Design a protein around this ligand. Sequence first.
Ligand SMILES: Nc1nc2c(ncn2COCCO)c(=O)[nH]1
Length: 114
Amino acid sequence: GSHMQDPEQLKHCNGILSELLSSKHAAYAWPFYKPVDASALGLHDYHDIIKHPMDLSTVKRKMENRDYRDAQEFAADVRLMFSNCYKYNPPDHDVVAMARKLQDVFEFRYAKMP
Ligand SMILES: Nc1nc2c(ncn2COCCO)c(=O)[nH]1
């Protein structure tokens, strides 16, 4: 059920999303900018292991099209994106180190929900 705080909380979500895509975090955010191109990377098992792909360009499109109805729905997709990375890759892989740093950015600012 829609709350009157939902538009404002979604604005905070959109702010976080803008930050995740900004130059400030680009050194570790870039693997998450676009959908994993499994074939191009030779990751021919990716879509057998990851049943629900997610990436920041897909989150952005969903925010722009008002697909997300509340902050929780946005947050679940962002976390899905990170969880896919932790599921597919070995935990010492550099892409996982980048995921953890970007998720720290996400979680600490998401916790600042006004
Ligand atoms: N190994 C691997 N590469 C990824 C993953 N997520 C993002 N990338 C890198 O894609 C960006 C293009 O080089 C992932 O989970 N698997």
